[PDB]
């Protein structure tokens, strides 16, 4: 309190400014000169009463000015309605907050006045008066509801609370202990006077005024007024219907990038049109960039805004592309002749050094044309297997594909004829995939050309894999997932000759970079000249002339002459071979010849012949993913010094300015990231400059601002690289602390191949770009409409969570910000469903609603978080012929514990493939074929899976080479997003198991009988669950709400507010229209009263027969009031029995209780009441309900019963329970037990209720 009061004092001291000069201000002097005011001298208490009664009269006049007869203002200013309001009466009772603020201020004022009126009547002493004024200014917020009306008033309360604290303890030392009274009200008085100083003119202004796309449209209106008002009347009557027609046409021609030109137009009005188009174009461009920068930062917006903004930036990028293609066609080729001849002869020397044989044309029958054509058609129908409803242009495509299936040889003849003859092609459409961060194109190709291009894609990759065209450092490969690429890269870093020995000044350099504008800077003529060396010239002309085609977007057509078309089938070859030409420019021919080795004995990826040719050059590790290069250097002292000297020769640095601008990893701490010593920074600048000098800028360009250099030396303890979405920090064992060996996840222990001891540690993290892409996917899931069912949203969430975790398996546990983001997005997804249930926010909501599987009627949600199942939610019940039995059965298991790590899976894969090799070697020599008996011990173990060995399509899938880069490039061809782009199930198998998750989910939620208590199953009269089925992926929202109604409509979910339905006794907590629409349909046509009267008539027919066995002389059915069936405050007797002579009665006991001792209080009249119940999950125990209703209705002066001896029978319809409590005469209890059993088994009204429940839930058996 001291620190906060000192905070307010420092703020008032800092925000102080001198007041502005003005005329001196006298309100009462101007009031005095008016003849309507008089002056007198009065006591303070009398004028204090006059002010508050005048304020009461003012508020009364303001209430009855609007003819509001139903609102009563108390004399302590409490405003209350006299009755229950209606819709229009709530509309006519909408005052401003200034009204209720003035109400509470006058309430405070009347408290302050009446505190002294209590004093001057002789009731209290002034010692008791000063305490009372002290309580008021301290507890304004507790005595008044003024805090709800102004929120900034919360500043004024706590300050007056803090001044409440200090004085008290400064008062409470010495002989003073505790108790009421200080009497120092001035400190609380000044603050509320200073508050009234600011609140006064706002309330005066309110009483004063009580008692007494558009900007562009206005700009266009001003421009049209400036045009039309200058022209005279005979031209005003003509150009009002002349300009407006072509005024939109000029804007449309600008939007379609059409040059606007019309004859017969004067030049100043043409310049005015050009100024109009230019101003609207600047407004539209700034609006489009502003709307993109709003939604980039995560601000929510309507979906139509995103749909329009995508088209706006699509048109702007089309105008930019038509500009840059015209710039290429005007400026000529950007490449010189000498660079082209240099890279041409470089490719010639590399193909002569490897003795490569060129890929020929398939002459008549390659005897594998059918397999490649079937694989191409399966890749074309791979995208169309998602949905079963397609458009007409796609139905034509599937018809052409099925005609290619039915007649394959004619299709092959058409493909070969289009290869040998066709050079002109149809126009390719363009669309954009709406990622929130990065715009990405998707191309649309004619299907007859697409079949030919897909067969060309298959044939070219199948020939390129056979002829060994690509060296193994070109990545990705078919056999390696990218985390296995990261692991093999770390093992290649570890297994070098003395890579961590830096005792003599050695250095490690880890460069990572991206070829900037790799796809857009490929000259097609240069592509053809480099392509004619490896394939047929007709095939090269087919691949070259395909890129020179017109791209269309709906109004805009432009030819392509610079850059390749990335959406083609065979374009995945064009990416990979040309980058090998980059391998000849960065790595050099000698080092690439050392890495690739002899053609007669090629080396492995990150392997060499010997150690001498491995360490004879500093350039000793190299890798390239599709556009990102990753290079690793080992330097000595003298080579690094000479390289720094060669850098500082042309580029000196007198002020050491190369430190500012160095890219560094901010996700790691400062002791973890790169330390920027001057030698290491100069060495990194020298390395990047030496790599940049080897590439001609007209061919390709690397940039420092998108690159990264990590230097390991004596002054840097650790090495860093970003690769394949992974942040990796390598740290030596010998440069750190002792043996300790604490096991953590996200840590790869690195060991040597030869010595097999631990040498270094690799630390894994998820980079920022993957987390931002995941948050983009979460925001795309949060763009679901209100009519969308919950199960589709949960399925999209589960798809995104599997696509995150099954790629980032080990690295999620290491990073904590992603673990927080997952939980935050999970709570947002759950809140999206909780708002869709009811608009009011519930206090609690069970997780068992979400995480119930779809087979049991739930959503089937996956879990990444710490969710606890509380007690008294795992208890269930059952009813049988001896009575009611209760039973009692924790955390929800998560996803990351049910997925294998990477390193143990790699070790297991190596072991099972070595064992498979040894068993295959023993099987060949013994003339034995391997079966499932020899491979049942290593089932679903290994990358790739062993399941691919026993597939029917071995000879078909064995001919599919180069599938991973095509699977990655599927995103440029299909408009949907592609999770699992890095894998394919037919080749690598299934890499996870999710049935244990469902098993532990069913086990952890208390079992099936524990789950089905929430699900309204016992109202459906199915004895088992296993014989049932759902009516058919998704569940509707009404059926979901009606299914989970026992656990939603509870007292502890929507606290306080409860209502009762009219014709039933159903209590609704809060209000849910989606459940009310089902409760009206099920309980229609007075079904509650029909069930009640049916049970009454059936029990009266029970008491009608067997008359002499109970000594009954008269059974009587009482005149039941039609509102008795649902009124629950009081009740009445339903069936009355008259004893013949006399009956003995017992003490009130339960229906299942057999310990009956009867008393001597013999009565003649006996009464039976029937009560129905609609319960929920926390309150459905019918025995204590019957006991509580009997003890309520027999011990009050509101219910009427003719006899003090009777029984109350309670039936729960939500779970179909029945019990009884009360007095019993001899022979009545087993009779009524068997009678209620026969009623609950054979009441036709209950059968109508249960069949309406089964019709509403759509659940059959």
């Amino acid at each position: 309190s001291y620190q906060k009061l000192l905070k307010y004092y420092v703020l008032n001291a800092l925000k102080h400014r001198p007041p502005k000069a003005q005329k001196k201000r006298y309100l009462f002097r101007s009031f005095k000169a008016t003849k309507f005011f008089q002056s007198t001298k009065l006591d303070w208490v009398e004028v204090g009463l006059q002010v508050c009664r005048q304020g009461y009269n003012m508020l009364n006049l303001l209430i009855h000015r609007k003819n509001l007869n139903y609102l009563h203002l108390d004399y302590n200013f409490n405003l209350k309605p006299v009755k229950t309001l209606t819709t229009k009466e709530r509309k006519k009772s909408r005052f401003g907050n200034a009204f209720h603020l003035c109400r509470e201020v006058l309430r405070l004022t009347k408290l302050v006045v009446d505190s002294h009126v209590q004093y001057r009547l002789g009731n209290v002493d002034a010692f008791q008066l000063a305490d009372g004024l002290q309580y008021i200014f301290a507890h304004v917020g507790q005595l008044t509801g003024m805090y709800r009306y102004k929120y900034k008033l919360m500043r004024q309360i706590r300050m007056c609370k803090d001044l409440k604290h200090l004085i008290y303890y400064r008062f409470n030392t010495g002989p003073v202990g505790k108790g009421p009274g200080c009497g120092f009200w001035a400190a609380g008085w000044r603050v509320w006077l200073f508050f009234m100083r600011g609140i006064t003119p706002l309330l005066e202004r309110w009483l004063g005024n009580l008692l007494a796309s558009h900007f562009d449209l206005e700009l266009r209106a001003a421009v049209m007024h400036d045009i039309l008002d200058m022209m005279p009347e005979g031209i005003k009557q003509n150009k009002a219907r002349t300009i407006l027609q072509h005024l939109s046409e000029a804007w449309r021609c600008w939007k379609a990038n059409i040059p606007w030109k019309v004859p017969g137009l004067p030049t100043p009005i043409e310049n005015m049109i050009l100024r109009y188009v230019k101003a609207k174009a600047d407004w539209w461009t700034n609006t489009a960039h502003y709307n993109r920068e709003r939604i980039r930062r995560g601000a929510t917006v309507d979906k139509t805004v995103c749909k329009k903004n995508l088209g706006r930036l699509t048109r702007l990028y089309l105008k930019a592309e038509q500009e840059r293609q015209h710039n290429y066609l005007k400026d000529g080729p950007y490449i010189t002749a000498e660079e082209a001849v240099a890279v041409y002869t470089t490719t010639v020397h590399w193909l002569e050094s490897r003795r490569f044989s060129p890929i020929p044309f398939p002459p008549l029958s390659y005897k594998h044309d059918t397999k490649l054509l079937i694989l191409a058609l399966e890749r074309l129908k791979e995208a169309y297997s998602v949905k079963s409803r397609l458009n007409q242009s796609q139905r034509e495509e599937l018809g052409l594909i099925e005609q290619a299936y039915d007649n394959p040889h004619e299709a092959l003849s058409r493909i070969k004829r289009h290869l040998l003859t066709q050079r002109a092609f149809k126009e390719v459409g363009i669309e954009f995939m709406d990622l929130y961060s990065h715009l990405v194109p998707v191309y649309d190709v004619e299907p007859l050309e697409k079949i030919t291009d897909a067969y060309l894609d298959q044939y070219l990759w199948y020939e390129a894999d056979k002829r060994r065209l690509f060296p193994p450092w070109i990545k990705p490969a078919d056999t390696e997932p990218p985390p296995l690429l990261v692991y093999k890269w770390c093992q290649g870093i570890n297994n070098l000759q003395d890579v961590w020995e830096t005792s003599e000044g050695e250095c490690n350099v880890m460069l990572e970079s991206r070829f900037e504008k790799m796809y857009e800077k490929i000259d097609l003529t240069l592509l053809n000249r480099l392509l004619r060396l490896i394939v047929d010239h007709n095939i090269a002309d087919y691949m070259t002339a395909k890129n020179n085609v017109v791209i269309n977007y709906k109004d805009m057509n432009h030819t392509n002459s610079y850059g390749i078309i990335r959406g083609l089938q065979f374009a995945s070859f064009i990416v990979q071979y040309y980058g090998l030409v980059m391998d000849l420019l960065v790595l050099g021919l000698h080092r690439a010849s050392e890495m690739a080795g002899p053609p007669q004995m090629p080396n492995d990826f990150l392997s060499f012949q010997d150690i001498a040719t491995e360490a004879a050059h500093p350039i000793r590790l190299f890798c390239r993913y599709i556009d990102r290069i990753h290079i690793f250097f080992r330097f000595t002292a003298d080579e690094a010094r000479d390289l720094i000297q060669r850098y500082l020769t042309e580029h000196p640095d007198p002020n050491n300015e190369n430190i500012v601008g160095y890219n560094n990893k901010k996700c790691w701490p400062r002791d973890a990231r790169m330390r920027l010593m001057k030698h290491d920074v100069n060495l990194g600048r020298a390395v990047f400059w030496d790599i940049k000098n080897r590439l001609p800028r007209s061919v390709t360009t690397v940039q420092w601002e998108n690159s990264f250099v990590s230097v390991y030396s004596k002054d840097n303890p650790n090495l860093l690289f970003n690769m394949c979405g992974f942040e990796c920090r390598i740290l030596p064992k010998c440069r750190t602390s002792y043996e300790e060996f604490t096991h953590k996840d996200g840590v790869w222990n690195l060991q040597n191949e030869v010595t097999k001891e631990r040498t270094a540690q690799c630390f894994l993290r998820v980079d920022d770009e993957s987390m931002q892409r995941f948050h983009n996917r979460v925001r795309q899931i949060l763009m679901a409409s209100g009519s969308t069912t919950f199960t589709k949203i949960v399925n999209k969430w589960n798809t995104a969570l599997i696509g995150l975790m099954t790629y980032f398996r080990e690295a999620v546990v290491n990073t904590q910000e992603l673990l927080d983001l997952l939980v935050k997005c999970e709570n947002k997804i759950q809140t999206r469903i909780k708002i869709g249930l009811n608009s009011k926010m519930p206090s609690r909501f069970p997780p068992v609603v979400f995480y119930t599987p779809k087979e049991l009627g739930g959503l089937g949600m996956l879990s990444m978080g710490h969710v606890l199942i509380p007690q008294s939610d795992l208890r269930w019940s059952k009813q049988t012929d001896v009575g009611i039995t209760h039973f009692r059965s924790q955390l929800i298991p998560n996803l990351y514990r049910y997925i294998q790590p990477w390193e143990s899976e790699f070790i297991d894969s190596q072991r099972v493939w070595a064992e498979y090799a040894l068993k295959r070697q023993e099987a060949i020599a013994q003339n034995r074929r391997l079966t499932l008996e020899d491979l049942e011990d290593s089932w679903d173990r290994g990358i790739p899976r062993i399941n691919t060995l026993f597939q029917k399509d071995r000879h078909t899938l064995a001919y599919d080479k180069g599938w991973r880069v095509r699977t990655d490039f599927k995103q440029y061809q299909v408009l949907k997003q592609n999770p699992f782009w890095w894998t394919h199930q037919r080749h690598d198998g299934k890499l996870w198991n999710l049935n244990n998750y469902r098993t532990d989910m069913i086990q952890a939620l208390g079992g099936v009988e524990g789950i089905l208590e929430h699900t309204l199953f016992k109202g459906t009269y199915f004895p088992t669950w296993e014989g049932l089925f759902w009516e058919k992926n998704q569940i509707p929202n009404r059926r979901f709400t009606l299914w989970w109604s026992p656990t939603i409509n509870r007292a502890n979910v929507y606290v306080g507010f409860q209502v009762q339905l009219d014709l039933t006794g159903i209590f609704m907590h809060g209000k849910i229209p989606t459940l009310k629409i089902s409760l009206i349909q099920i309980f229609r046509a007075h079904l509650w009263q029909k069930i009640h009267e049916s049970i009454v008539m059936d029990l009266c027919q029970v008491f009608d027969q067997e008359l002499d066995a109970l000594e009954i002389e008269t059974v009587q059915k009482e005149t039941i009031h039609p509102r008795k069936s649902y009124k629950m405050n009081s009740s009445c007797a339903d069936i009355l029995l008259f004893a013949s002579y006399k009956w003995n009665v017992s003490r009130p006991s339960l229906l299942a209780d057999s310990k009956d001792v009867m008393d001597s209080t013999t009565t003649q009249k006996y009464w039976i009441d029937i009560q129905l119940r609609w319960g929920d999950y926390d309150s459905h125990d019918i025995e204590r309900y019957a006991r509580a209703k009997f003890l309520d209705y027999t011990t009050d002066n509101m219910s009427i019963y003719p006899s003090p001896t009777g029984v109350l029978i309670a039936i729960d319809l939500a779970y179909n329970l029945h019990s009884a409590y009360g007095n019993w005469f001899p022979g009545s209890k087993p009779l009524i037990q068997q009678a209620m059993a026969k009623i609950m088994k054979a009441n036709p009204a209950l059968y109508v209720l249960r069949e309406r429940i089964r019709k509403g839930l759509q659940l059959y058996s």
């Binding site: 996840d745 927080d820 939980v823 909501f845 978080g865 710490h866 998560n894 514990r897 294998q900 089932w939």
Partner: peptide, 28 residues
């Protein structure tokens, strides 16, 4: 326990990643 999914930061001490993960038997 008002819903409120909690963060997994610091709430794993004895729980590994490979634990409670099972594989399937070969079908038929």
């Amino acid at each position: 326990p008002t819903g409120e999914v909690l963060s997994l930061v610091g709430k794993l001490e004895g729980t590994r990643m490979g634990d409670k993960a099972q594989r399937t038997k070969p079908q038929m």
